[PDB]
Amino acid sequence: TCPFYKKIPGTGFTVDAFQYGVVEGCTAYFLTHFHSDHYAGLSKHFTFPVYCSEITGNLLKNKLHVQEQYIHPLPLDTECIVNGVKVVLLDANHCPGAVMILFYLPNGTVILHTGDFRADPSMERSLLADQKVHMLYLDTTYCSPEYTFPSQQEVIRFAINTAFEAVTLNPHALVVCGTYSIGKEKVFLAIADVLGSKVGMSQEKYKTLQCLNIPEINSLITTDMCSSLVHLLPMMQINFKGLQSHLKKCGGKYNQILAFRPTGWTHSNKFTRIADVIPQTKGNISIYGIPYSEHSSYLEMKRFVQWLKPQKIIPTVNVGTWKSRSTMEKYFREWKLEAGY
C-alpha cells in the first residue's frame, strides 16, 4: 500500500509510486528521476500514463522497455495541463533528467515536490519566485548539521589535479572510476578531458549514457577499452581485489591504478578538508573516496526552505524512525522561528 507522502491531495496523482501495484484513484503516475528506489516496479507491462522529463523518458523506453504510448515527456520551465491540473517541471540539480514538480491545485493550494535535489541559490530565480507555496514535500536525506561537504566544483578540481599529476608522473598508470547508477558523470568526464582520453565502459553503461542528451557525448565515451586510459567499472569492483583483477586484463599496458569512489557524505567529512584527502594504498593500487554529493547539505537545505517559507513540510527521506522524524521536526521549527514565517 502506497504511503501518504507519495500522494498529492486533491488530485488523481502519485509521485515515485510504482511498487504498490494499481494505486486506487491514480490517473497519472509521476516519476521525478531514474534511480531504482524511485522507479521500483516499472517494466514493459506497465499500462498507465507516466509523466516525466524527456531524459527520464529516454531511459524508461530504452532501459526498462516501457512502451512509447504510456510515456508522457514534458519540457522544463513550462506550464502544462495534466488531467485538468496545471503542473510545472523544474531542474532538481540531482542526476540527469531529475525534476522537481509544482502542482497548482484546483482549490488554490500550490504544492512543490522536490523529488531528490541538491538545493542551490539559482532556484530562487526559477518560476518559484512568482508565487506562494503552501506544502513542500522535501528531500531530507542530509537534514542534520553534521552533514557538511564541499561544492561539486571543489571536488572536481581535486579529482582533475590528482589524476593529471599521477598520469604525468607515470604515463603507464590507468585511472578507474566507480559507478552504480546515473548521476555524478562530471567525475569521469572531467578526468578524461584533462588526460585527452575517451572514457571506456561496458556496452550496458554506454547505452545508459547515450539516453542522457549530453552535448558532444560521442566525442567523450567509448566501448573500446583498449583505446581509453580512463575506465568505468561497477562500484562493487572498486576495492584492491577487484582492481588487481582488472589490471590483469589490460595485457601489460599498465603497471599502476589510480581509482575513485564518489560516495555521498562519509564521517571523514567531520574532520578532513578536501585539500587534505588521502587515498588507501596497497602496492601499485590507490583508492580515493571523494565526497561528490547530488543531495543538499544541511546548510543548502536550510537556506532554500527559509527562502521558500512553506506553510507545511512533509519529509520524504528518513521517515521510518521516530527519532529521525522528531529530529527533522525540531529543525523545521528552528528555521521557521529564526526567519519569522
Q: List contacts with Ni ion (CB under 5 A).
A: 35, 116
Distances (CA, A) of 213 to 34, 57, 114, 208, 324: 14, 12, 22, 11, 38
Query: Could you tell me what percentage of the chain is helix, strand and coil, using 3-state DSSP and rounding each to the nearest 5?
Result: 35, 20, 45
Cell numbers linked to 156: 572536481
For Ni ion, the closer CB: 3 or 10: 3
Amino acid at 118: R
For Ni ion, the closer CB: 183 or 200: 183
Residue 152 gets the label, from left (phi > 0), alpha (psi -120 to 50) or beta, of alpha
Q: How far is the CB of 184 from Ni ion (least distance, A)?
A: 11
Cell numbers linked to 130: 512568482
For Ni ion, the closer CB: 35 or 205: 35
Cell numbers linked to 38: 524511485
Helix (H, G, I), strand (E, B) or coil at 11: coil
Q: How far is the CB of 295 from Ni ion (least distance, A)?
A: 8
Q: How far is the CB of 116 from Ni ion (least distance, A)?
A: 4
For Ni ion, the closer CB: 175 or 185: 185
For 69, how many CA atoms within 13 A lie in the half-sphere containing its CB? 5
Mode of pairing for the β-strands spanning 312-315 and 135-138: parallel
Q: How far is the CB of 236 from Ni ion (least distance, A)?
A: 19
Question: Which residue do the cell numbers 582492481 mark?
Answer: 243
Q: How far is the CB of 10 from Ni ion (least distance, A)?
A: 26
For Ni ion, the closer CB: 93 or 269: 93
Q: How far is the CB of 140 from Ni ion (least distance, A)?
A: 13
Q: How far is the CB of 96 from Ni ion (least distance, A)?
A: 11
With vertex at residue 149, the alpha carbon angle to CA 232 and CA 169, rounded to the nearest 5 degrees, is: 45
For Ni ion, the closer CB: 198 or 295: 295
For Ni ion, the closer CB: 94 or 302: 94
Do 88 and 65 touch, CB atoms closer than 8 A? no
